[PDB]
Amino acid sequence: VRTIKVFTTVDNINLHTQVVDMSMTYGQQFGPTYLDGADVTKIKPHNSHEGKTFYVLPNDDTLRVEAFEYYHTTDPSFLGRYMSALNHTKKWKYPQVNGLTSIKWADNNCYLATALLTLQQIELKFNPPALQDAYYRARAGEAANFCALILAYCNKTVGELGDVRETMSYLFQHANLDSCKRVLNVVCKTCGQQQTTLKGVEAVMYMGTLSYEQFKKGVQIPCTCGKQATKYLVQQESPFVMMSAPPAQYELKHGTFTCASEYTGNYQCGHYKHITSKETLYCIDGALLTKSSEYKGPITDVFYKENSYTTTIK
Ligand SMILES: C[C@H](c1cccc2ccccc12)N(C)Cc1c[nH]c2ccccc12
Ligand SMILES: [Cl-]
């Protein structure tokens, strides 16, 4: 019986030394096994595997605690889905554009590139160590693990078309937004006024207007009575806000926003670009960078810096 030593892991933090039989498959010895994202379940050990780290499914109480503490999920499919995405994302290119890590276009990844660019510019702390650790690598120019984790957390596969807003709402569930707070007042000429308070993810995201200034002054929404009412922002406590609406032609003014999602196409099929406000306006389209003093284009998300806002409307 010939053997080598390898490490198995669910997290790549806690390594578990294993003596492996070179006459059995990894699958026979460990269950589903991954080597740098590749499924080696049905492969027999090779001498070059000595001292390498293999991922395995949590098949005992030790591994399940380690996996839960790292990923903050008990979904047994998660590790498998992360490894299948990572097997493709480790082959993408991560261009440095304007001091930011982007992604060269591939497998409809424009929505992921736009989310990655946005996450480098808004103030957000991820709760799971997996996302904290992979985000740090993405900043250092190696975003493959971060992109594969986003796909696993959102239950999306490489190649699937995606929406930036939907992606940010899933990721924001894993971010520490617990103390974010939004107070709204809605004024109806029939029904009167209604003040509500939102906490967490709901406190930082709004669907129906791109303009943070217009949200502060009043937006028109349908009341339950069938009239139009006026909704406005009374108080905001958060490090950023995300304002979204169905794609429409919109003017981004230098200095008035952090970054924005441009979307061209239709609900089914389309392309995201990323607009950021530095000393001038930059349009990041994967690896491609164009700059202008002005922008007009089909915008669907705008991100704004915030700390504490209280309306002066009495
Ligand atoms: C920006 C876009 C979108 C957002 C909101 C309203 C829209 C109205 C008309 C056309 C596009 C619209 N996403 C990508 C479409 C989209 C939403 N969820 C998805 C899931 C998978 C693929 C695309 C999508
Ligand atoms: Cl973080």
Ligand SMILES: [Zn+2]
């Ligand atoms: Zn009403």
